[PDB]
Amino acid sequence: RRRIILFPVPFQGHINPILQLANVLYSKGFSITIFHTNFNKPKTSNYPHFTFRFILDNDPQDERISNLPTHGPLAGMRIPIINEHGADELRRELELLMLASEEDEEVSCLITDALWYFAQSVADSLNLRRLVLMTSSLFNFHAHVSLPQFDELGYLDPDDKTRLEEQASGFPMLKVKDIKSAYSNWQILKEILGKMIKQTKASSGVIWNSFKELEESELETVIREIPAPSFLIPLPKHLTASSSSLLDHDRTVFQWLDQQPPSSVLYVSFGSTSEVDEKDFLEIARGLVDSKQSFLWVVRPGFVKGSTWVEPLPDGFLGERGRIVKWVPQQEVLAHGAIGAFWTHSGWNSTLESVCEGVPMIFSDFGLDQPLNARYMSDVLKVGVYLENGWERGEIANAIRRVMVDEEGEYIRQNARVLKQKADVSLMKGGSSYESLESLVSYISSLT
Numbered sequence: 001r002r003r004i005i006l007f008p009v010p011f012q013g014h015i016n017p018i019l020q021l022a023n024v025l026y027s028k029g030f031s032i033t034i035f036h037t038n039f040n041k042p043k044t045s046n047y048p049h050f051t052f053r054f055i056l057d058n059d060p061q062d063e064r065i066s067n068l069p070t071h072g073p074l075a076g077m078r079i080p081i082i083n084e085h086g087a088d089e090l091r092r093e094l095e096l097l098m099l100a101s102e103e104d105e106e107v108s109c110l111i112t113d114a115l116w117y118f119a120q121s122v123a124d125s126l127n128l129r130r131l132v133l134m135t136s137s138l139f140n141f142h143a144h145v146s147l148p149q150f151d152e153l154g155y156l157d158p159d160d161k162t163r164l165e166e167q168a169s170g171f172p173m174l175k176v177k178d179i180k181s182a183y184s185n186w187q188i189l190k191e192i193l194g195k196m197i198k199q200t201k202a203s204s205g206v207i208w209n210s211f212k213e214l215e216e217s218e219l220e221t222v223i224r225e226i227p228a229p230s231f232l233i234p235l236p237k238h239l240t241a242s243s244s245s246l247l248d249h250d251r252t253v254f255q256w257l258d259q260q261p262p263s264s265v266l267y268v269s270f271g272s273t274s275e276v277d278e279k280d281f282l283e284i285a286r287g288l289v290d291s292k293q294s295f296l297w298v299v300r301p302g303f304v305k306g307s308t309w310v311e312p313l314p315d316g317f318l319g320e321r322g323r324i325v326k327w328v329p330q331q332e333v334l335a336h337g338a339i340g341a342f343w344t345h346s347g348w349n350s351t352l353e354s355v356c357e358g359v360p361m362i363f364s365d366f367g368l369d370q371p372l373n374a375r376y377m378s379d380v381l382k383v384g385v386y387l388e389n390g391w392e393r394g395e396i397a398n399a400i401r402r403v404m405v406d407e408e409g410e411y412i413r414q415n416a417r418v419l420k421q422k423a424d425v426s427l428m429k430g431g432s433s434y435e436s437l438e439s440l441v442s443y444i445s446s447l448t
């Protein structure tokens with residue numbers, strides 16, 4: 001037997017793909033151990049076939065994390081902190097587990113989130129191979145490696161507000177404004193992304209949550225920048241992430257979806273950490289009403305600054321056609337026959353889930369990789385429309401109708417159906433994703 005240890009970043013967009021990958025690898029005959037923080041832990045009772053080991057977070061807590069908020073923006077401070085200080089404990093936990101290993105059992109490798117760059121030298125120090133899971137797109141990695149050129153051209157300077165609507169220089173898939181929001185947290189990101197890249201290039205292999213026919217234009221960059229083999233597997237085509245949900249599913253929504261005509265419902269969800277002003281929240285509500293479409297809107301408590309959930313919303317505001325809920329099994333909703341479009345914040349998991357279920361998109365964004373996802377999907381693949389100028393109710397209503405009803409949007413709807421079919425085909429024998437998965441299993445079995 002061969003065991004794989006996986007080490008996720010403890011946020012919804014990172015736990016989801018790594019436990020999909022864990023299940024795919026389990027299906028291939030590997031045993032599975034998950035190293036996880038107590039913070040944001042998933043429900044281990046959902047994974048009787050995995051062993052969980054909780055680390056880095058144990059009582060009593062380090063002065064460096066003991067008082068970090070558990071929600072809101074700053075919860076993410078755990079990522080730089082653990083990278084800076086978690087090495088010794090990670091090494092101890094890996095050695096512990098390796099020491100207790102059975103005789104016919106060996107640890108093939110460690111797979112970590114790409115953002116745990118600190119784990120590379122820990123793995124090296126144990127003669128343990130480390131593979132990296134990328135939870136965001138090849139297109140974004142391509143942008144990351146281009147940061148020095150972006151820096152030189154002034155794109156990363158926030159006070160330089162000049163060339164906003166222009167094509168970016170030798171990266172003409174983007175507009176300058178895209179790069180400016182993606183990298184507005186430049187003081188922190190330049191450090192983290194530089195080390196992420198370096199330790200990804202130093203790893204023994206890189207698993208991408210993508211597929212070749214999704215990001216064909218980006219494969220050359222990955223082959224040239226990363227010496228180790230890359231494997232593109234679209235995890236939502238293997239299984240949904242419902243078992244790793246960190247929140248309770250409403251699931252009263254499906255009875256409601258069963259009462260709607262096919263493709264008549266706009267699914268709306270702006271992610272698992274984004275926050276909005278009261279002014280923009282109410283404007284989004286208005287646009288949804290103005291569109292005249294049915295909608296199912298996931299509003300995370302705390303999404304509105306600074307109400308506890310949707311208090312600013314007048315009771316019954318509009319309509320018979322709309323519902324607000326706290327949380328759903330998202331991919332299962334996207335797969336429902338009633339869904340005609342997905343208004344998303346462009347998180348990569350949501351974007352890829354929508355592509356894999358053939359649902360065209362309306363794009364907003366809250367920075368990070370989201371504006372690049374939105375730009376690539378709307379301008380390269382052409383499976384959605386990007387609301388790239390804030391929140392105006394009239395523009396929102398037009399975007400929703402263009403995707404969902406207008407004849408002029410048919411080509412977008414059709415592009416989304418075809419892209420889903422390409423994803424499905426990529427999993428057949430001889431398809432790109434099937435071959436990537438076969439090579440990954442063979443490769444990992446050889447490290448042992």
Ligand SMILES: C=C1C[C@@]23CC[C@H]4[C@@](C)(CCC[C@@]4(C)C(=O)O)[C@@H]2CC[C@]1(O[C@@H]1O[C@H](CO)[C@@H](O)[C@H](O[C@@H]2O[C@H](CO)[C@@H](O)[C@H](O)[C@H]2O)[C@H]1O[C@@H]1O[C@H](CO)[C@@H](O)[C@H](O)[C@H]1O)C3
Pocket residue numbers: 011012013014073074075076077079080115135136140185188189192193273346347348349368369370
């Ligand atoms: C690398 C990161 C370092 C980080 C440390 C915390 C820091 C902030 C949040 C900046 C503001 C101040 C501060 C202090 C703050 O906490 O407010 C800073 C930037 C983003 C962050 O990663 C982000 O952390 C969030 C939790 O707070 C996660 O929820 C995001 O995951 C989610 O992961 C998804 C899958 O990767 C992604 O598609 C989605 O947009 C994202 O919201 C994840 O996105 C990462 O952002 C990076 C930016 O360059 C990308 O390159 C990575 O691929 C991407 O995964 C967290």
Ligand SMILES: O=c1ccn([C@@H]2O[C@H](COP(=O)(O)OP(=O)(O)O)[C@@H](O)[C@H]2O)c(=O)[nH]1
Pocket residue numbers: 012013014016241245269270271272273298326327328329330331346347348349350351353
């Ligand atoms: O109501 C919801 C909303 C979101 N999700 C899941 O949460 C993850 C969000 O990841 P993403 O990368 O899109 O954005 P983030 O929230 O991390 O910014 C995805 O796998 C979604 O399917 C869900 O399961 N139920």
